[PDB]
Amino acid sequence: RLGLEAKKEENLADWYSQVITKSEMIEYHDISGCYILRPWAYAIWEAIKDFFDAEIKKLGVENCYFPMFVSQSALEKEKAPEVAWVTRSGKTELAEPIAIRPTSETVMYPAYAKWVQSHRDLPIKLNQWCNVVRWEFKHPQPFLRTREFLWQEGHSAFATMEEAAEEVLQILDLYAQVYEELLAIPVVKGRKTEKEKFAGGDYTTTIEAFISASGRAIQGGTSHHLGQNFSKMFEIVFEDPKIPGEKQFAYQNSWGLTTRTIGVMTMVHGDNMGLVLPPRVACVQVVIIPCSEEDKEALIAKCNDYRRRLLSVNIRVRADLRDNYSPGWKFNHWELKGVPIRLEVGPRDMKSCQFVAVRRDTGEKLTVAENEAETKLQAILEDIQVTLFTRASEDLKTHMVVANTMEDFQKILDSGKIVQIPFCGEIDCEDWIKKTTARDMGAKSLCIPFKPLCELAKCVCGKNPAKYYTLFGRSY
Amino acid sequence: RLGLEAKKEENLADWYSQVITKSEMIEYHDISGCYILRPWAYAIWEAIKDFFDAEIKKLGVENCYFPMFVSQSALEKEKAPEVAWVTRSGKTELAEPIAIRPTSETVMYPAYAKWVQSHRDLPIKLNQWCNVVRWEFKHPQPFLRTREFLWQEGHSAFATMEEAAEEVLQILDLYAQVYEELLAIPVVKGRKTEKEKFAGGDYTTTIEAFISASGRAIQGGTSHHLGQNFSKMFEIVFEDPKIPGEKQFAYQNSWGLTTRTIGVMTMVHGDNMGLVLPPRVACVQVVIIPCSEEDKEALIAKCNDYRRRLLSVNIRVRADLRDNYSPGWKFNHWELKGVPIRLEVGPRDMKSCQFVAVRRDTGEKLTVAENEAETKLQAILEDIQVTLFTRASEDLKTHMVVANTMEDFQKILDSGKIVQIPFCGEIDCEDWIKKTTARDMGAKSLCIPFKPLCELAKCVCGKNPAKYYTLFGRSY
Ligand SMILES: Nc1ncnc2c1ncn2[C@@H]1O[C@H](COS(=O)(=O)NC(=O)[C@@H]2CCN2)[C@@H](O)[C@H]1O
Ligand SMILES: Nc1ncnc2c1ncn2[C@@H]1O[C@H](COS(=O)(=O)NC(=O)[C@@H]2CCN2)[C@@H](O)[C@H]1O
Ligand SMILES: [Zn+2]
Ligand SMILES: [Zn+2]
């Protein structure tokens, strides 16, 4: 089949499966929940990596790599169902089983304890780009809920809570920046409830994205304040410089962002014609397509001219000069892959000193003169990035509203919206909301937003007063 | 202890353990054969990555990521003792065991078969930067023989053997370039014998390095011609464009280089004062050390002046302005870490418009005027990189000689040298050489060099004639 079959509003699952394969991003594997990242998908991850990696180095974070294997002893200092266990090498069984990391707290922090003698050893700010395994036996999805996934995990240890408190929001803003400025995805910054917070953590901050096709929200990336909980388990301690004899535990953060990003990018921006790449993230921003043997070679020459002219303005461009494929095949092919701009030039356009420039987001065919080629296209790329963010941003505002009763909350949820409600914060009430909304698949707490829409008031459960406005909704 | 205890010539094992820990490169882990890569070690890998990654993109290779998990079905298409097996997730056991990749041929090539319809789909040139597990139950060493290790693995598929034949040597030259131009390690390019070649491969080319302290050689990185062996196992086939009806198998290469690089860098260049970084690879090329409160702040100002002046010539520099450590502590500290140049400036030097510049390789203390600071230091950095390569290169020539009998071969081997001998290529003779040299730990074939010292003659075993001069020696 040439293009997509299922519409996004018709069958999101089929639509999603078709767009990720037809855009040459994903290939399926014979192990469930594991997917192959083809260059078109991996290039986006590299764009995210290059940005985020450069930004954390300004904050004084340094890259590293810890082992993928965790001892049982290390895991049970903290203490599971998602942890993959290696039990044999070849035919011979191991004396003791060894676990694949779902996260590296128990791997890294024993070494942190050895590196901390005094407060001058702090702060320690380390990051690693690696893979982790979480054997979640649900229905896995490419990018969004994968059994293996690439990510970064940062782990910081400080002398004071206040130092650690500032980094949490610094990192969370960098994640929002990755979602908003790179991927053009609007996000809601907030604190997780007690039920949804990171196990062993003091508090978890999160960025919540909204996938309007499902009417479901998704956790976009979290920054955790572990406090002194992990530094006690592994005895990360230093001499108190203010108090002669006493000993103080290190205040720790951990933070992580994954290849889920690419899945949210696909789900939000993608349309019924295929993938849609934000220019800031697209490895190919512009694709040049040629539209007598001498006249054919002249058409090739014009394309190589436009190619190198765009490279001189650092615009990531590629010329598709393969003569084995027709122009019509190329338009559709690069449509599916979601290249922001198709630079189209035919015999008549070449003669008239111009070319057709097709925007991927709108489908607008703009005729630009050869002299205004490199100034206009970057203006178009910027407008594509802005159009994508604005469209999605307003899509979020429209689908996020306030409700003060469980009755109004239910109907708003049924319309495919997420909604902020007066909430006490207690976990028994949170389970009741999931239970009641499922019977009337259940709605979960997404985050307690830093900037809520309205201000406080009885709780939705109607037993005790409300502590804060909390964002609820159906979720991935 | 302030510095190293064991001498390199005295106890290489203790020396190696002390230099990797005292230079803050390695930290030990509670799983045998697995080691923590601290920033100082990881930064070198990043330098190698940035170079190699940029170079293969010029050749038209694209990055990707395949799953770490391999099905049993996929492994036995090719067909083991080194393969780690996952058998349970949490408390519940998996229906079928799943293996951790020691290499990704069986993971990638089923997908390659699906992507190849016709010859226009070829060539496919893919690379991935990832971790792999080889549960080798020997005595593991940090960097050199690790149970988990970071690497890159490239996998290419072509229409013709000749295309694949050119890439093999292109990639091998890039590995030599990584060893010689980045790490300043001299290497011997050669073809592996039939015994040592990659299982399922047509032929393996290799770069052999020499660690003079042991008198042992080590495999530095290999580029393999898999031929049609793997494309038959997984049915990677396309329509023959020259022959109407017949069907042709894809000609494949695979190639890999690992964090072993850093181990060979440490073993070759390191001395009895600690690590020695080649300037091209050092994340800190120059370290500035300060040597009345107003006069102290003036000394700090001069250091920040030199710092930013070196950043303006893109020299990677850091100022160690920590007042909690003494100058003497800093000299030794950065000596152990092997920073090419210690830029030292004291009160008297500041007054005289000059500074002491200490080379790490030689220990030469050069006084450079403040005006000639940024032109001379880059000349010094270049001379350090050249001095390291030349010293090591001649170290190799001196320890690599020719022998024509088994008698002379034995004594030359006992002097701690590697030696090229007349060899037929057969595996029974190769085992006899390992057996005889062990009793008189055994010597193995290293490579059949492309540029041998001498030219052909009976074999060393003395049964049949010799086919080629082959490099033998004790090995890691
Ligand atoms: N199965 C998954 N597939 C893809 N991404 C996943 C999956 N599970 C969680 N994530 C994403 O990882 C992010 C970070 O995971 S996290 O559990 O919230 N945090 C940690 O593990 C911290 C960092 C080191 N310890 C989440 O925000 C979520 O978006
Ligand atoms: N245990 C090891 N630790 C560190 N490096 C190791 C270890 N075993 C092999 N190596 C290094 O990997 C290199 C590549 O490994 S290789 O076996 O020679 N080749 C492959 O696996 C090919 C690439 C994809 N399939 C070797 O040259 C060797 O120097
Ligand atoms: Zn309540
Ligand atoms: Zn022989």
Residue numbers in the entry:
A (entry chain A), B (entry chain A): 1013 to 1091, 1098 to 1309, 1316 to 1464, 1474 to 1489, 1493 to 1512
Give the published text:
The incorporation of amino acids into proteins is initiated by the 20 aminoacyl tRNA synthetases (AARSs). These enzymes attach each amino acid to its cognate tRNA, which is transferred to the ribosome to be used as building blocks for protein synthesis. Based on its molecular and structural similarity to alanine (Ala) and proline (Pro) (Aze has a 4- and Pro a 5-member ring), Aze is a dual mimic that might fit into the active site pocket of alanyl-tRNA synthetase (AlaRS) or prolyl-tRNA synthetase (ProRS) and be activated for protein synthesis. To establish whether Hs AlaRS and ProRS confuse Aze for Ala or Pro or both, we co-crystalized a stable analog of the aminoacyl adenylate of Aze (5′-O-[N-(L-azetidinyl) sulfamoyl] adenosine, Aze-SA) with both synthetases.
For all the experiments with Hs ProRS, recombinant protein corresponding to only the ProRS portion of the natural human glutamyl–prolyl–tRNA synthetase (GluProRS) fusion protein was used. Aze-SA fits into the active site of Hs ProRS in almost the same conformation as Pro-SA bound to Tt ProRS, showing that activated Aze is also a close mimic of Pro in the active site of Hs ProRS. Importantly, our co-crystal of Hs ProRS with the adenylate analog of Aze-AMP was closely similar to that of Tt ProRS in complex with the Pro-AMP analog. The dual mimicry of Aze, and its ability to ‘confuse’ two human tRNA synthetases, is established by these crystal structures. In a competition assay, we observed that Aze could efficiently compete with Pro for charging onto tRNAPro by Hs ProRS. Activation of Aze also resulted in significant production of Aze-tRNAPro. Consistent with an earlier report, Aze clearly escaped the editing function of Hs ProRS18. While Hs ProXp-ala hydrolyzes Ala-tRNAPro, it is unable to clear Aze-tRNAPro. Here we show that although Aze is activated by both human (Hs) AlaRS and Hs ProRS, it is rejected (>99%) by the AlaRS but not the ProRS editing system and therefore almost exclusively misincorporates into Pro positions of proteins. Surprisingly, while both Hs ProRS and Hs AlaRS activated Aze, only ProRS was successful in completing the charging event.
